Structures are given as C-alpha cells and as structure tokens.
Design a protein around this ligand. Structure first.
Ligand SMILES: NC(=O)c1ccc[n+]([C@@H]2O[C@H](COP(=O)([O-])OP(=O)(O)OC[C@H]3O[C@@H](n4cnc5c(N)ncnc54)[C@H](O)[C@@H]3O)[C@@H](O)[C@H]2O)c1
Ligand SMILES: NC(=O)c1ccc[n+]([C@@H]2O[C@H](COP(=O)([O-])OP(=O)(O)OC[C@H]3O[C@@H](n4cnc5c(N)ncnc54)[C@H](O)[C@@H]3O)[C@@H](O)[C@H]2O)c1
Ligand SMILES: NC(=O)c1ccc[n+]([C@@H]2O[C@H](COP(=O)([O-])OP(=O)(O)OC[C@H]3O[C@@H](n4cnc5c(N)ncnc54)[C@H](O)[C@@H]3O)[C@@H](O)[C@H]2O)c1
Ligand SMILES: NC(=O)c1ccc[n+]([C@@H]2O[C@H](COP(=O)([O-])OP(=O)(O)OC[C@H]3O[C@@H](n4cnc5c(N)ncnc54)[C@H](O)[C@@H]3O)[C@@H](O)[C@H]2O)c1
Lengths: 333, 334, 334, 334
C-alpha cells in the first residue's frame, strides 16, 4: 500500500502508470488532509517539503516502513522519531543542483545590474541613464558562499568564471574549489569581507537563524544577500529591520519563513503571520527579488524527480535496498 | 589647443574641467547638433559619445578639426571616409570594460531563461503558486550561439562554457584560444539552426546591416532566445516584431535597437518619432522581453576607465605623443 | 484642566499648541495605548482618532477623565457603556464633511462601472483597442441601494438621482426630503435583491455587525457592485472573499475593511497579522476591485474643519459653555 | 441597392447581414482606405465610423454615392463642403447616448480629484499610510467650466450642479434651461481664469482647432484639472505636454487625443508614428493623468442604440422615406 501526497495534478497520471502493479493512493493535497483510514494502511508514503511529518502525524501510521521525500531537503521530517521506530527515510540528493545554482546567479545578476529598477523606468518611458541605474561588475566583487555542497560549490564556480574573489564557509573544505581559487575562511571573515553573500546550507539546529541581528551587523553596508536554502536559516525579523535601515544593496529570497502560507494560500483557512506581510512588502521594493521557492523548478529537475522517485519505490517493493543506498537519510538498520 | 566635449553628463563636468584645466576647453551636456556654429568653427579636438552623429554635413562646419575622440568602443556614428579624405584623426576606447557588456548579456539571458519577469508579475498579484507557465529551463542543457567573438563576445562564450552550455561561434576570425576551451566555430546558418540562445556582439557595418533579418530569423529554432547588446541596426526590428507576434521567441533581450536615440534622448519633444519606437515600447511590456536603454556598458568600472582613457588621449594628442595612444586609433596617422 | 491629545499628525502639532497655548496640553503623534500611565492619570480631556481603542481596560487608567473628544464622525472605537456608568462625556465631529465621503463613494462606483482599472492595465501594455472586455455599463440604467441615509448616505442617494439612477433607500428612520426627491424606501431584503449597486453608510454597532454576511450576499444579484465606506466590521470579510472567488461581483469598492489598522499603521512590524489582511491584499490586485486605505474623508476641507471643530469643543469645555457644543455630544450631561 | 459598410466590429457583422439581407450589402471590418476601388465605385450608400477618412480624394472615387451614414455623433471625418457641392446626403446618430460620455467625463474628474491612481500605486507597494501626497480636494468647493453645452456638455454641467460645484459655461448657443438650473455663461477667458476643472465638449471644426493652445492654457489656474472627451484636435497636444512638464496641472484626463488612431488601430504596424503618440504614451504613465482609448461612448446601451439607428437610417433611405430620419441629417436634401 503506497501513499503519495502533495502531488501536482499533472503528475497524477504519470505515477499511476509508472506504479500500476502497486496499490496506490494519490493526493494532490498535503498529508494533514489525508483521512486516518488511509494513513493507517500506508506502508510507503511519498511526500514533498510542505508535508510536515511530525511525531503526531507519524503516530497515526502504524504500518509505515519508508518515507520518501521528492526533494533534497528533509528538515520537514522528524528523523529522530523514524530512527527510534525503525522507519526508513529516503530523499533525492541530486536531481539538479544546477537548477538552484543557476537561479542563484540569476538573482545575483538581476540585483547587481539593477534590472528591476530599469524595468520600472522603461515602463514610464524613462530611457535615460543616470546614477540610480549605475551597475556594478561581478569581477570587482567578493562572493561569500555559505555551504559549498552540491549547490554551493556550483555557485562558487560560476563566481570564479565571472572573475569574482570567492570566499567559502563550510565544515567540509573542498580541494577542488581550493585548487580553482576559492578561499575557505571563518564565518566572521566571510561576513565582513563579502559584497555578495549566498546561503546553501540545509536547515538544522545548527543553521537555525544563523543569519541573525548580530551576523547581519557584521556585513558590509550595501551587501547583497541571497537565500535559496531554507527560510529559517535567516531571522526574517532581523532581515526586515536591517532592510528598513538601508543595510542592503539588494535581497534575493527564494525561501523565507512562513512561505507555505502564501505558496499554499493557507490564509483561505485562517492562517497568517507578520512575516508574510513583511515579505509581501519587501517583494514590492525595486532592489528585492522574491520568488516562491521555485529555484529548483526546471523541466530537467521535474523529470529527474519523477525518475528517482519511481526507482526508490520499485527498489523498496522488491527489497533491493543496495540499489538505492545513496538515497537514504535514515538507512538500515 | 581648442578642445570641445559634447554629450557629457553633468556629473562628469567637474572631472574633465579639472583634468584638462590648462587647455582651452568647452563642455556641452547636450549633443553636437546643438552646439553653436561659432564654437564648432574653433574646435581642434572634439570628444563625443555614440549619439553625437558626425556626418559629412556636421563635420563640414569644423574647419579646424584635427582629432575626433569617441568615448566608446563603437564608431559607426562617425563618417570615417570623410575623416580619411580630410586628414581628421579618429580615436576610440576599445576596452574600458568588455566584462560590463558580457555580464549584462548573461543577466538578460538568465532573467529570460528563469522567467523572472513572469514570476514577478505573479508575486505582485499574490500568486505564489507553481505551474507550467513558470517552469524554467537550464542553461547547462542549452546551446549558446555567439555571433562575433571579439573582446565582448569571447567573454560571453566563456561564461556560456562555465555554465555547461554547448557554445557555437561565428566570426571571420576564428580564435584558437576559444576552440581550445570547447567553443565550436560554425557557419552562420548552422549556428542559427542549432542554438537555443543567440547573442550578437558584432560592430555595425555595411556588412552587418540587418544581418538578422526575416530570413535568418526563420532559420532559428522556434523557442529561441535572442539577445542584442551590439547595435540596433544589426537586427531588422520590423522582422523581429512580426516574428515575436507569431510566437517565434521564448524571449528577447534588447539593450540596443533601431531608433533608440529618440527614446533615450527624448527627441520626441522636438518632433521625432518612428514606428520602431512604438514597436519596441509594445515589446517592452511583454513578460518574456527585457528592454534596457543601452546600458550594458553602464557600470562604475566602465565610467572610471572611460574617464581615464579619454583624458590620456587628449593629453597625449596636445603633446604630440601619438605612439602612447596607438591602440586608440580607428583612423591613425596619417 | 489637563488636556491630552493622541494620534495627532506631526503636521498638526504646532497648530494645536498655538490654539490651546492657554491650557496645560500634552500632544502625542502615537496612539493612546503608547501614552505613559502617569500622563493617562493626569488627563481630564482626551482628544483621539478612530484607531485609539478607548476600551474599558484603558479608560480604567484615567480616573480623572471628564470628556472624550474623538476627531471623527464614528465613535465605535469608544466604550460608551463604560463612559455612561462613570459619567464621562463623549464628543465627536458629526459633520466636518459628509460630502468628502459621498464623493469618494461615487468615485469608486464610477471607477468600477467604467472599468477604469482594466482599461489602465490595457493602456500600460499599449493595448488601445476596444472590445467587450472593457464594454461599460451606464449608471442611468442601474438601480442603486443605499443602506443608511444619514448625512453621508443621503448625499450618495442624491448623487445617484442626479445620474438618473433608480435609488432604493434603507434606514431605521425614513426621510421625507429623500422620498420627495424620488428615493424609494424599502425593506433590506428588497434592496439587496433589486439593487445593481449597493453602498453602505451605517455606523458600526452590535446591530450592524456583519450585517453583510453569507446569507445577505446570497440575496444580491449575480454581478452586483458592492461599496463599503462605512466600517469594516459591517461586512463579513470572509463571506465577501468567498463570494468574490465564486464570481459573485462585477466589482468591489472598499475604503474600510476588517483589520485595516494592521496595514494602515504597519502593526505587522510589531508581530500583528491576520488572514483578512492577506485576503484584502489579494483582492486589491484584482482589476474589478478598488481598495483605499480609509481615506474617503481625507480632503483639505475635512482636515481644516476637524481642526476648527476640535479647538472649538476643547475651548467650550474648559469654559463651562456646554450649550455651544450641544450638537457634538454623543454621551451628553448627565 | 449597393450598400457598403466599413469599420464594422466582427461581432456586429452577422447582425447587419441579417438586418439588411433584403439588400446588396458589402461589409468590411477594416477602414475605407482598405476597400477595393471596384467596390467604392459600386457603392450607393456608405456607413462608416470616426476613423474612416472621407476626404474629397476618397469621395471623388465614388461616382454613384447618394448617402454617407456615420455611426457616430461626430462628423469631422467627412468633407461636408464636398458632399454639398456634389449633392451627397450625410446622416449621423446625434443622441445614441450623451449620458455615456458625460458619465465617463465625471469618472475621470473624480479619479483625478480623489487621486485614485496615486493611491492605487501606494496600495500596490503595501503603503496604506495617509499623508499630504494623497490629500484630496472636494468637488463641492470647486468651479467647473464646461466648454460646449450641447447634449453631452449640458449633462456634465448638470452633474456638476448635483455635486455642489459652481458651474461656468461657454457656448455660442445659450441654453435657457441651464441658466434656470443655476449654470452661469461667461466669456472663454473668464471661464479659463476662474475654473478649477475644465471639460471640453465641442465638435471639431476650423473654429475649434487648437482652441486650447499655449495662450489659452496660460490663462488657466496653476493646479487646474483639464478633461477632454471631445476631439483630440481641439487641444494643441504640444502646448499641453509642455505645460504639463512645467507643473501646470493637478490632473489631465483625455479620452481623445491627436493621432490617437495610430495607437487605437495599431497603424505603427504599417509604418505610422508621430511625436504626439510618444507624448501621449509618456503622459499616460503619470499618476495624475488618465488616458483612455476613445471609449467614453463605449457602453452596452450605446452599442445597442447605434445598431438600431443605423438599421433605421438604411431602411428609411432605401424606401425613400426621408421624413423618418429627418433628425439624422447633417447634410439634408437640396
Ligand atoms: N530553493 C530551492 O528550490 C531548493 C532546492 C534544493 C535544495 N534546497 C536547499 O538547499 C540545501 C542545500 O542543498 P545541497 O544539495 O547543496 O546540500 P549539500 O548537503 O550537498 O550541501 C550542504 C553543505 O552545507 C554544509 N553544512 C551543513 N551544516 C553546516 C554547518 N552548520 N556549518 C557549515 N556548513 C554546514 C555541508 O557540509 C555541505 O557542504 C538543501 O538542504 C535544501 O534546504 C533548496
Ligand atoms: N550595449 C552596449 O552598451 C555596448 C557597449 C560596448 C560595445 N558595444 C558594441 O559591441 C560591439 C563589439 O564590441 P567588441 O569590444 O567585442 O568589439 P571587437 O572589435 O573586439 O569584436 C568584434 C568582432 O566582430 C567580428 N566581426 C565584425 N564584422 C563581422 C562580420 N561582418 N561577420 C562576422 N564577424 C564580424 C570581428 O572579427 C570581431 O571578432 C561594438 O562594436 C559595439 O557596437 C555595445
Ligand atoms: N470612510 C470614511 O472616511 C468615513 C468618514 C466618515 C464616516 N464614516 C462612517 O460612516 C458612518 C455614517 O456617517 P454619517 O455621517 O452618515 O452618520 P449618520 O449618523 O448621519 O448616519 C447613519 C445612518 O445610519 C442609520 N442606521 C443606524 N443603524 C442602522 C441600522 N441598524 N440599520 C439601518 N440603518 C441604521 C441611521 O438611522 C442614520 O440615518 C459613520 O458612522 C462612520 O462609521 C466613514
Ligand atoms: N469621446 C467620445 O466617446 C465621444 C462620443 C460622442 C461624441 N463625442 C464628441 O463630443 C462632441 C459633442 O457632442 P454633443 O452630442 O454634445 O454635440 P452637440 O452638437 O450637442 O454640442 C456641441 C456644442 O458645441 C457648441 N459649439 C460648437 N462650436 C462651438 C464653438 N466654435 N465655440 C463655442 N461653442 C461651440 C454648440 O453650440 C453646441 O452647444 C461631438 O461632436 C464629438 O466630437 C465624443
């Protein structure tokens, strides 16, 4: 008995055909709206990043053997509970690191070349040139990459190709990046010296609100800050207060705290926070780009997410766990 | 020596006044067509930018002119044959910052490919959903075709390679340095047929005039992205417009376009307007078109370097130290 | 006596200090909830505006208070029962300019019926064509329903009559002057079923609370236009939003709405936000909706008259001259 | 009888085909300039709209023509002198809906005086605050100047009286009904100097050509609001633009403007464009300007009535019953 939640409509037929041998229930809605009689039956659930797999929810799933998330991130799942109950958790670590790294650079270039402000001028038939739209060049700037994993290492490499000085912060210091010119530094040194800072760490207890009041105060006046990692890596209240004081040349955010309320229109069922309003206000500024968690959202990513998802599910029904060993977050035993 | 500067932004006037203070210097923020005849007659060296149209008719009114310096890479605004006939020297600035334009080109390419204008429209309407109208493509799955691989175009090709793009190149000079990095030089027709993103980096000449015309556009893939940061007359704007309306393009990025100067200098306050002005204005509002007002070059670094190189050319010339600025000559001695 | 002014715009501070220079005056641009308790305790006359919540809990801390003057028509933000049991007098400004709000209502009705917001979107895209998507209706062919025919609503009904509209009127009190001009007083349910445009002009009370709710919206014609310049809580925003999403309305014009103060005063900078904030922000983007930030009253004459009436009331109260401000009492002697 | 219809909207085609199937009817959705010469020479009756230019040149190609019917109030697009000289009859529709245009006129006035465009800009940026940049004015404090008190202008004056405006009027034909309602006729110069809002409602003729020019605009109050729903050529667009840039106006509202047909019919698709197109496009983007694409008339009742009157005129002419359509004649028999 296989359960899929938060599946877009157009994937519904693809998963029915690809998994025809199995007993499969598919919901376009999230797991909190699935009836308890279907939760009780599920041996394998497949979710995405807005399905909160809390202890409370997972307790209603006594037959659950494996959770597969169609994502790189897995911070939406209570792993400690899964470890203690013997539930396996899989993910898709590398459907397309390029998608997010390319999106990150799209935002950096959009901001540094002031494209949004130019577009506002052009709409007013203002084709003049003046200092309000005077751009900077990447080759004169320092890029600070926080997290040099699959996505961040690509961001670091695009930086180098543009002639940027590249600083890096990670617990794992990569030879390949060092040989190419990147310099690994303390967090405090990266925050102080960078002109463009970009976040590429997972959300964990250690990265929780790591960009906070204190860290933001260490950054250069006029820094550019990009977040394509997770919203809760950044203290949105501190971000907003700093923006209002003019701290930033620009902000690029593809992820932000309480995003799910906007992205899934949960305000139709009573939800809202001050952080939703803060983000909507920022979104209107001419030196801010907010995108709705779509850095991954390319044709290549969606094709790979399908492929890998089908592979993990078939592997598990046959018991061939060796086939999917690179997919485990919580593996055997 | 009597030195005349035209089209100088007011913010640059103090700089040139101090740097050239021991010359007989006259500075106009307006363009050369607006300069009084009594000033034109006296001038021995003029420094212009790309909207100062130095035609035979205008140049005839400057009987003392010895050198034209354009604060720019491009010199298609200058009647060189007339200059050669008359013995007028012409300099330019070949390389203040090729990176400015190459970076801008990629800014536009990524804007279009990640559909950021469309996304921004949705976010404004509180539409934070995801669906196929905003499904992006990846650069690393695409072929870039660079038309012109000079200072600017070669850098664009290298950025393309660094994104994992297949890069096709067209130029009359085939650079071994680009071949060895992975760029493949092809015929024009092959580049047009196979490229998903095409970017133009050739000068405007009689040979590149409407090079991108109805025929060449029809050879492109449906869904191509076309970028122009070279000169507007390299592309037939009437044919580009008709093609856009038939849905030929995934996107257009234009920093330069025919008749741009009417919009950029607001010449419609003096009675000027063309159909291409209205066509570009209509395209500017589409969610898959980016139009910028010839500002690919307009960075802080470019401006610094344009200042420095222009002051070096003027001082060299007044001294007679011509070998010092040999790299700046378009029409050199003698 | 000790006079306390709250929510005074910075631009008005020098005005009031000068007018009331003879008194012991404390002015705040912030609201009453952010005034220090020692100043709350001294206060014998307090002047406020509509976002100052004079709750029982807040009025508890003002043991020396004799008079509350709100610089406004509305007084729903003031606990009148608590004032009555404690002997606190309450004044307001009943008629600084009902024309300001009635003109605003009509600006909204005309905006929507003439589809100006949609036409503007088209024009911004250089779309100057004509088609059924901007085909307008005429007011002279429509029926207006006016709910509340007081100082503001009666003027709205008269504007409608001048436009050749059939005007239906609903109020707890019938007016002969309006009937003689041609308004037809009817029951609420008849007005709701027969009006093409419905506009609200009642005060917020326990009886008007969510007066426009699910049931009553369901009585409206499909395609009705609904205007609210009264008070936000007269309409159930959730039922409104739901009906809107099903296509109930040709248009909506809201100058007031539930939880408006969170947006108007940016209280989200201190943690506040509701789902009604997001519903209104979403509606605000629609091309058949106009949302304004409670500014129907906000004209130059209004502000002038509010300043004048306010010094009048304060000076009359500090003298014993209660007759002079007889018309200003909401809760009078004794 | 050979009947020719030009500039017919596609959705009207079946309707006129059914209405006139007893006749030899040729229907085009394009303008008269794009009708083949063979068809122009057959035509006994022609029905056109305001963008069909019936110049002497075009009419001279129509030897068999007895009657031109324009589906419009306006007839400045027909060379009347020619028609008289040659005995050609000319009808129009004088009163399908003067209320449409008069209501549109007040929709623009109210939009401008209540600063709705600027408020919408603020609301879009989540700025729901109140300050002097959105302080509105009140109509009832202002003087309206109506230039042209015909069918449309007279209604506009009446609405103004309904809003408590002092109404000044200028026309060569005085109407006693308007004086009896409280309108006051004055000289042009006095109307220009004294009015806070001015609205134009004259036909286009030699005498009204550029009526509103540099000199007339200079007589207006600084801060004036100017509206035009008459004809673009009544206003000197260049003078209006120049005055706007000097800060002369609190607002402008234009439903008609010089060279509008290039934008409205997209003639820039065929190489047309003028400076006034670009000036209008620039003004359209300002927050105190509303431009609409000649749609003041464009209401469902207007379209219904234009259809009915056009059918009656055609059916009458073919039957010879000229007495029926006596009210429709611009140029009547002999
Ligand atoms: N915006 C999007 O569309 C989208 C799409 C995919 C992934 N993501 C996010 O991006 C994240 C990164 O993805 P990835 O594929 O690069 O992951 P990764 O695991 O390959 O890289 C993360 C890097 O962060 C480092 N790191 C973790 N904790 C750290 C700490 N506290 N201090 C210093 N370094 C630390 C790791 O050492 C690793 O190098 C995901 O976890 C997910 O949250 C977002
Ligand atoms: N948008 C902007 O702000 C901006 C700024 C600077 C330069 N430009 C434009 O970019 C152009 C290129 O600048 P660059 O510095 O790269 O110049 P470059 O001279 O270094 O490069 C030009 C290249 O074009 C090739 N070429 C010329 N004519 C050709 C033809 N007929 N067919 C095939 N190849 C041809 C040459 O071989 C050369 O490789 C300039 O001439 C200028 O017009 C635009
Ligand atoms: N948007 C704004 O800027 C703004 C400005 C001023 C006033 N207002 C609001 O408009 C309201 C009306 O102002 P006004 O000057 O017309 O006041 P008003 O007292 O003259 O009119 C109120 C009318 O509503 C009627 N009414 C009261 N309760 C009713 C009920 N339960 N059912 C039917 N009718 C009822 C009364 O009989 C009266 O005729 C104010 O109370 C205030 O809430 C808004
Ligand atoms: N914007 C639109 O959608 C649209 C629609 C219909 C009509 N119109 C325009 O509005 C005009 C007026 O329409 P109407 O039905 O009121 O016409 P009308 O003929 O009833 O009124 C015109 C008035 O102008 C006056 N007038 C004419 N020439 C004058 C002059 N030289 N000086 C002073 N007064 C003069 C006449 O005396 C008359 O009172 C039409 O001719 C047309 O151009 C525009």
């Amino acid at each position: 008995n296989v359960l899929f939640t938060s599946v877009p409509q157009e994937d519904v037929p693809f998963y029915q055909e690809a998994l025809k041998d199995l007993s499969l229930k598919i919901y376009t809605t999230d797991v909190s709206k699935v009836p308890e009689n279907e939760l009780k039956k599920a041996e394998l659930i497949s979710v995405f990043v807005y399905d909160k797999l809390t202890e409370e929810l997972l307790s209603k799933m006594p037959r659950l053997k494996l959770i597969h998330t169609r994502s790189v991130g897995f911070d939406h799942i209570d792993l400690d509970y899964c470890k203690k109950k013997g539930i396996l958790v899989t993910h898709i670590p590398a459907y397309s690191p390029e998608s997010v790294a390319e999106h990150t650079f799209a935002m950096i270039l959009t901001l540094v070349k002031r494209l949004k402000r130019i577009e506002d001028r052009v709409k007013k038939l203002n084709f003049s040139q003046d200092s309000e739209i005077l751009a900077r060049e990447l080759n004169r700037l320092t890029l600070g990459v926080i997290g040099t994993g699959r996505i961040g290492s690509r961001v670091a490499m695009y930086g180098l190709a543009f002639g940027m000085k590249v600083l890096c912060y990670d617990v794992v210091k990569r030879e390949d990046l060092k040989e190419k010119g990147c310099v690994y530094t303390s967090l405090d040194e990266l925050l102080k010296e960078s002109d463009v800072i970009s976040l590429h760490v997972p959300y964990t207890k250690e990265t929780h609100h790591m960009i906070n009041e204190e860290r933001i105060s260490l950054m250069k006046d006029g820094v550019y800050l990009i977040n394509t990692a997770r919203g809760k890596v950044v203290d949105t209240d501190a971000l907003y207060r700093a923006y209002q004081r003019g701290k930033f040349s620009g902000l690029g955010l593809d992820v932000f705290e309480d995003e799910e309320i906007l992205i899934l229109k949960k305000y139709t069922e009573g939800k809202a926070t001050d952080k939703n309003l803060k983000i909507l206000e920022l979104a209107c500024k001419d030196n801010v780009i907010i995108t709705p968690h779509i850095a991954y959202y390319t044709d290549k990513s969606l094709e790979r997410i399908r492929e890998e998802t089908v592979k993990v599910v078939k592997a598990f029904v046959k018991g061939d766990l060796e086939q999917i060993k690179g997919n485990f977050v919580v593996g055997p035993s």
